[PDB]
Design a protein around this nucleic acid. Structure first.
Ligand SMILES: [Mg+2]
Ligand SMILES: [Zn+2]
Ligand SMILES: [Zn+2]
Lengths: 49, 1358
RNA sequence: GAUGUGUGCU
DNA sequence: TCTGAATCTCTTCCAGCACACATCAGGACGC
DNA sequence: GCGTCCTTCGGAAGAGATTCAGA
């Protein structure tokens, strides 16, 4: 009864880069940071998959 | 060539002698056909020819006209590289003050003319006058006149007396001053005066005067008359794309100076008005100051877009100057750089160079052999052949790369194992394959890091790489004798899966005829690797004088251990593989192999271990799944218990039982206990959860779970990281160091909330910020440790001393952290140690005691060996081999000529850096203790309480009222086996000297809320505490009870600052009770933030709590929070509240009362008694009116400053204190460092010795001169009948002890280049090039290793 | 050559 | 009211190697 | 186009200058 608001979705705390990591709730947040940065660093391959 | 570097002030005549011309136009290259101007900053006539052996005008063009001077433009034809060797000068129209000798503190001009810096600064910048030659008036020789006072003195004293402003007046003051007469007048005044501040100021000015008069310097040389200019090739103008030119800063500053000088020169000829010419002189002064040291004045001038251009000092000082960027470390040819891969097929002396990189590194070597074999006739043909990469070039490369070791260096070269030499093995690729064993030494994984290749060129360099820097000769860490090429994280997993047993197999009851049979059965698939069979194994032993005698037996082993036995070299017992090998087990195996057999069998054993670990880790498929992280079935019950406890804690706190600084501590403690209980539950559910039949019924065994396998084997993981996977994650730590109030109750096998992840991010960002933002202040520590101990090398073999420090096992709160063996291994003893068969010697005096002697000492159970230390050595300029000990990288005594001061500094300085760059491997876990509250004695024995002042309890027991007490457990034999530090106000369930059963509590207390318990009984009066002024009080009117919290120095009023709240214990009749045995009333002070639950005038007993003091000790206790302490110990910072020690022994009594602070008089029984000490009212005194004290005994309590210890308890006490403190700090993190390095650093901290009396020597009264020189002079004088000079050792921090050395080059290259060079120029110091940094800067062989013999030959040659 | 930004491994 | 103690103010220090990109370099006014 | 020219803001420590107070 005391509540008066609620978060829209579970994705609203993370950014657009850290929200592309599957199973983010199981990684250590240092590994989440490194995964986000490395995912930003990827070069497009010959055939997209 | 040369043997010294002398620095001094530059006279104007000498500056003109340096100059080859006079720059007098502010014009660089004319932005045209690239030729210099007439007499600008670039000039062929002044500095040198632009083109090589070509005249500027176009008259002389070849070497056939060398040496002649042209006539059309007057430029001599010579080599064009003389443009960086011929300086110029600028004839300043007016004198200008040197900013280095004005605004560097203390100002040389300021304490040479005895004027304050403000007055001379206003005089120089034309804002006031100074009275030179006052004459027959009321004006002194240094008086400051403003404009109005100057006009008044002109109108009413318009005689020949003159008073000038600007640098001309200061130069007149300096030139008109006599130095010897002033020095003798100052000596007279110093002998007359008695105040210490005046004495110090006068002796500082006397020292400046003596430095000026002894050297060839003159006072008037600190005011510039001619300003030299840098040679043009050292300030080049590189043409960019187009007609523009590069933005040079020195050229801009020179142009500004020349513009101002020419404008002043023009105004001096046209008789400009006085204000204009004075303003122009001020502008010239500002321009020269900006040229010399920009930014030391008010505003640094900027070139473009608001950035200060660098002056002649900004490019000589700092991290980006000619000292730390181009002299102490340079860029090198024959070097390369690429990423690294594993290539585990290699050997310990091999690496993989890419085939296209070794061709470019060894290119001149290929040229030489191509010309030798005749395939080319010139260098260009061979160059083109190598460029084309023909089929014959690769064979030449193979021939030249055969036994030419290269140096592989990783980017942070923390310790000396970061540079190692490998024999290259050419590979096809672009990545440098690196042997998996040296990855621990390099601290190099294979996740994208690069290593640099360096090619030793000369024969001496190749042999230094093969005999010293070779990776084969680097199997022991130089910090501690533990091996450094240890199998890690895959070889240990292979050797742990191999050497293991489960109770079943393909064949278990079979009995084999040898290890070959076991390997044949495993490979043929007829027996599992974890069987329990009986193999017949022939192990050798060298118990004789080097003879291997075989002993064949039949041992109960496994198949895996029998297979592994085929690689163990002959000479080692079988009881090293007949167990479950982890990482420590095989590290010990390699260590004992090296200590028994030697180096070559150890290296071959390491290679074979790596091969058979990789093979049998591949053959196992030791994967990791999601079902391997078995969640315990009782975690949430432990969660519920702890949350109920926290709810009760909240209900107690809100009622008012505890404050908000104690709720934090208790909730952290209860959640840390719950986390440990959950971790224990999951570990018990993991380690033993393997119910397997014995071929009959069910049986228990150690689990084969993959997570538990790689956690127990020590491969990669621990209890923390594995706990966070299947137990609970726990509670995090903020970047500031504070622990998070709320814990995370989920692991990384279930999910995390949208909020628990947010909580974890605090610790996760703390871990990543800590590295990148606080490894700077740990690289700084090792830099200023290296720069203070760089010049310490082993220069002798034995000084012949019986002195040395005492070594005992360190038991300071638990079990034996380091036994005597670890603290005494490989160090030469100082006296014949006596076993408890006393009056008989056990070891001789000067024996380097190795592992056999350590075993002998432990057999007889010795508790104290007096060992020789570095700090107590008697050598001069270095240490002897016996006073240092073992090399710790090889199993022998330290060789003469070894740079031990750099090895010590690196060894101390890079566990901190490495472990602060690895704080995020635990994520962001709190890693704090559980705040143990009671003492549970595990062993059996009696108790001995040291330095205890205890009284009785209301129940009759003992309560401790002493600060530095220690509860030590002594067994039935008489040796100490356990020790504990009990705190103030802790009750005792048992006493001293009584035998305690093993496993019961003795001392109980509260981990927080230290009490102020009394020792007598009576009523208590609230003395000097009134509401609002010194106490914050709140009263519950329902109960009528008051709970006042005395404020700290922060919120206390300034008027009530002298009010001291305390509790006077009084009896019924208003009389002051007495402390038993003394006559002082029981007055007990209360510090800030203290709460008292008692009312005013309540009867009490003996030994009860009157007030409570919260502790608020909250920290993550990593190596990041915990290493400003090492910096404080090494810099010798005095603590906030020093413990008052006794300066002189004797009877202690009090004299006069309340001189603001209490007075204490110590009177000896025989000698003089002149000593009185001012004790502040802050701390009580542990001594009374009728006791006996010795020097070093503590009058008060608190942290000991490491200067009183030095000056009272001696050198051994202070070095032992520093060693113990640093060792405790490092050992808290698991760091293992031998104490030789800390002793070396302490010795380097102990090199200054203030003279007490001159004696027959030539030293002064209170001069601070090097201790080595004092010892040499005293030993030389005591040879004759003369009496030596008495001194007093000084302790300086690692910064001051490096900045106050005798060589100004090392001090200038370390820190404060301007301040060091200013003092060196004033004093006229002369460097002797004696250390290692000096010879590195100069460009010679260091007098440390292979250059030590050459330097000895050169020194004894002259 | 110096700045400014981004990045990699410690 | 002279001289240690305390406070105020100025100064110097803040890890290592490497890679990529762009921008600057007098720009205002006379000619 | 050629061409001569004239902001503030961290933070611990140490030294050296004032400034206090206290006998
Ligand atoms: Mg790495
Ligand atoms: Zn010429
Ligand atoms: Zn010695």
């Amino acid at each position: 009864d005391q509540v008066d608001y609620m978060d829209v979705s579970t994705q609203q705390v993370v950014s657009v880069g850290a929200s592309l990591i599957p199973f983010l709730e199981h990684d250590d947040a240092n590994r989440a940071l490194m995964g986000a940065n490395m995912q930003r660093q990827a070069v497009p391959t010959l055939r997209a998959d | 060539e040369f043997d010294a570097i002398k620095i001094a002030l530059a006279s104007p005549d000498m500056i003109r002698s340096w100059s080859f011309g006079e720059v007098k136009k502010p014009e660089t290259i004319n932005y045209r056909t690239f030729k210099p101007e007439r007499d600008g900053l670039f000039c062929a006539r002044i500095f040198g020819p632009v083109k090589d052996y070509e005249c500027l005008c176009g008259k002389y063009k070849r070497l056939k006209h060398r040496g002649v001077i042209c006539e059309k433009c007057g430029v001599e034809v010579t080599q064009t590289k003389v443009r960086r060797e011929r300086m110029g000068h600028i004839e300043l129209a007016s004198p200008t003050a040197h900013i280095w000798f004005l605004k560097s503190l203390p100002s040389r001009i300021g304490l040479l003319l005895d004027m304050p810096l403000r007055d001379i600064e206003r005089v120089l910048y034309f804002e006031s006058y100074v009275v030179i030659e006052g004459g027959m008036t009321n004006l002194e020789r240094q008086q400051i006149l403003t404009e109005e006072q100057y006009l008044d003195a002109l109108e009413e004293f318009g005689d020949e007396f003159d008073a000038k402003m600007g640098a001309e007046a200061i130069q007149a003051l300096l030139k008109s001053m006599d130095l010897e007469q002033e020095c003798e007048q100052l000596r007279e005044e110093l002998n007359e005066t008695n105040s210490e501040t005046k004495r110090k100021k006068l002796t500082k000015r006397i020292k400046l005067l003596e430095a000026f008069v002894q050297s060839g310097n003159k006072p008037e040389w600190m005011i510039l008359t001619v300003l030299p200019v840098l040679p043009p090739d050292l300030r080049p103008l590189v043409p960019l794309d187009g007609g523009r030119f590069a933005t040079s800063d020195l050229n801009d500053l020179y142009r500004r100076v020349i513009n101002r000088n020419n404008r002043l020169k023009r105004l001096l000829d046209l008789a400009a008005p006085d204000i204009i010419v004075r303003n122009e002189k001020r502008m010239l002064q500002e321009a020269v100051d900006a040229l010399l040291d920009n930014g030391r004045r008010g505003r640094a001038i900027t070139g473009s877009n608001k950035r200060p251009l660098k002056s002649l000092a900004d490019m000589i000082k700092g991290k980006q100057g000619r000292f730390r960027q181009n002299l102490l470390g340079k860029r090198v040819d024959y070097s390369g750089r690429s990423v690294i891969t594993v290539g585990p097929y290699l050997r310990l002396h091999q690496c993989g160079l890419p085939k296209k990189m070794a061709l470019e590194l060894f290119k001149p070597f290929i040229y030489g052999k191509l010309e030798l074999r005749g395939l080319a006739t010139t260098i260009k043909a061979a160059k083109k052949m190598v460029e084309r990469e023909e089929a014959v070039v690769w064979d030449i490369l193979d021939e030249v790369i055969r036994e030419h070791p290269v140096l592989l260096n990783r980017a942070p070269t923390l310790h000396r194992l970061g540079i190692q030499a490998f024999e290259p093995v050419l590979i096809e690729g672009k990545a440098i394959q690196l042997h998996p064993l040296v990855c621990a030494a390099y601290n190099a994984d294979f996740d994208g890091d690069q290593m640099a290749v360096h090619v030793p060129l000369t024969l001496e360099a190749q042999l230094e790489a093969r005999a010293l820097m070779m990776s084969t000769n680097n199997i022991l860490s130089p910090a501690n004798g533990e091996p450094i090429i240890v199998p890690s994280q895959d070889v240990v997993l292979g050797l742990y899966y191999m050497t293991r047993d489960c109770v079943n197999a393909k064949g278990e009851g079979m009995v084999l005829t040898g290890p070959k049979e076991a390997e044949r059965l495993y490979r043929s698939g007829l027996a599992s690797l974890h069987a329990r069979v009986k193999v017949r194994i022939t192990e050798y032993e060298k118990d004789a004088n080097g003879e291997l005698v075989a002993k064949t037996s039949l041992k109960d082993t496994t198949v895996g251990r029998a297979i592994l036995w085929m690689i163990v070299p002959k000479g080692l017992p079988y009881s090293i593989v007949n167990q479950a090998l982890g990482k420590k087990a095989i590290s010990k195996m390699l260590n004992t192999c090296y200590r028994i057999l030697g180096l070559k069998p150890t290296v071959i054993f390491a290679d074979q271990i790596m091969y058979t670990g990789f093979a049998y880790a591949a053959r196992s498929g030791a994967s990791v799944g999601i079902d391997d992280m078995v969640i315990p079935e009782k975690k949430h019950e432990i969660i519920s218990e702890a949350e109920a406890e926290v709810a009760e804690i909240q209900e107690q706190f809100q009622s008012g039982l505890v404050t908000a600084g104690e709720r934090y501590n208790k909730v952290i403690d209860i959640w840390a206990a719950a986390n440990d209980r959950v971790s224990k539950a999951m570990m018990d559910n993991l380690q033993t959860e393997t119910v397997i039949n014995r071929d009959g019924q069910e049986e228990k065994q150690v689990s084969f779970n993959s997570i538990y396998m790689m956690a127990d084997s020590g491969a990669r993981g621990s209890a923390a990281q594995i706990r966070q996977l299947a137990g609970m994650r726990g509670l995090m730590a903020k970047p500031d160091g504070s622990i998070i109030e709320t814990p995370i109750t989920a692991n990384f096998r279930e999910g995390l909330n949208v909020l628990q992840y947010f909580i974890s991010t605090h610790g996760a960002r703390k871990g990543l910020a800590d590295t990148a933002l606080k490894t700077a202040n740990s690289g700084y520590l090792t830099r200023r440790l290296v720069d203070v101990a760089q010049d310490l090398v082993v220069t002798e073999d034995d000084c012949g001393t019986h002195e040395g420090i005492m070594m005992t096992p360190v038991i300071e709160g638990g079990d034996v952290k380091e036994p005597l063996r670890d603290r005494v291994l490989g160090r030469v003893t100082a006296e014949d140690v006596l076993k408890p068969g006393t009056a008989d010697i056990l070891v001789p005096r000067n024996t380097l005691l190795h592992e056999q002697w350590c075993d002998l000492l432990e057999e007889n159970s010795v508790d104290a060996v007096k060992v020789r230390s570095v700090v107590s050595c008697d050598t001069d300029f270095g240490v002897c081999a016996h006073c240092y000990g073992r090399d710790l990288a090889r199993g022998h005594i330290i060789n003469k000529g070894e740079a031990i001061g750099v090895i010590a500094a690196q060894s101390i300085g890079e566990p901190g850096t490495q472990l602060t760059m690895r704080t995020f491997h635990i994520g962001g876990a709190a890693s704090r203790a559980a705040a143990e509250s009671s003492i549970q004695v595990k062993n059996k024995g009696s108790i001995k309480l040291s330095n205890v002042k205890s009284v009785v309890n209301s129940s009759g027991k003992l309560v401790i009222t002493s600060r530095n007490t220690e509860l030590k457990l002594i067994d039935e034999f008489g040796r100490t086996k356990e020790s504990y530090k009990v705190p103030y106000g802790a009750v005792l369930a048992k006493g001293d000297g009584e035998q305690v059963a093993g496993g019961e509590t003795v001392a109980n207390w509260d981990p927080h809320t230290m009490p102020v318990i009394t020792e007598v009984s009576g009523f208590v009066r609230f003395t000097d505490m009134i509401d609002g002024q010194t106490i914050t009080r709140q009263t519950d009117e329902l109960t009528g009870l008051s709970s006042l919290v005395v404020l700290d120095s922060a919120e206390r009023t300034a008027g009530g600052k002298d009010l001291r709240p305390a509790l006077k214990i009084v009896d019924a009749q208003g009389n002051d009770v007495l402390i038993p045995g003394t006559d002082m009333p029981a007055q007990y002070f209360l510090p800030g933030k203290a709460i008292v639950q008692l009312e005013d005038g309540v009867q009490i007993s003996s030994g009860d709590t009157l007030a409570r003091i919260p502790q608020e000790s909250g920290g993550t206790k990593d190596i990041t929070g915990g290493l400003p302490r090492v910096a404080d110990l090494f810099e010798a910072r005095r603590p906030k509240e020093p413990a008052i020690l006794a300066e002189i022994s004797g009877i202690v009594s009090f004299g006069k009362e309340t001189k603001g602070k209490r007075r204490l008089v110590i009177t000896p029984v025989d000698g003089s008694d002149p000593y009185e000490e001012m004790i502040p009212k802050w701390r009580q005194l542990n001594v009374f009116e009728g006791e006996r004290v010795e020097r070093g005994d503590v009058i008060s309590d608190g942290p000991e400053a490491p200067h009183d210890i030095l000056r009272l308890r001696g050198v051994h006490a202070v070095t032992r204190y520093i060693v113990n403190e640093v060792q405790d700090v490092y050992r808290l993190q698991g760091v293992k460092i031998n104490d030789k390095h800390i002793e070396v650093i302490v010795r380097q901290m102990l090199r200054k010795a203030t003279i007490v009396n001159a004696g027959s020597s030539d030293f002064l009264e209170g001069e601070q001169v090097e201790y080595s020189r004092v010892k040499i002079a005293n030993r030389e004088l005591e040879a004759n009948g003369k009496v030596g000079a008495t001194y007093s050792r000084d302790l300086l921090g690692i910064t001051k002890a490096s900045l106050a050395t005798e060589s100004f080059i090392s001090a200038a290259s370390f820190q404060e280049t301007t301040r060091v060079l200013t003092e060196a120029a004033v004093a006229g110091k002369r460097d002797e090039l004696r250390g290692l940094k000096e010879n590195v800067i100069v460009g010679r062989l260091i007098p440390a290793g292979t250059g030590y013999a050459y330097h000895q030959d050169r020194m004894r040659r002259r």
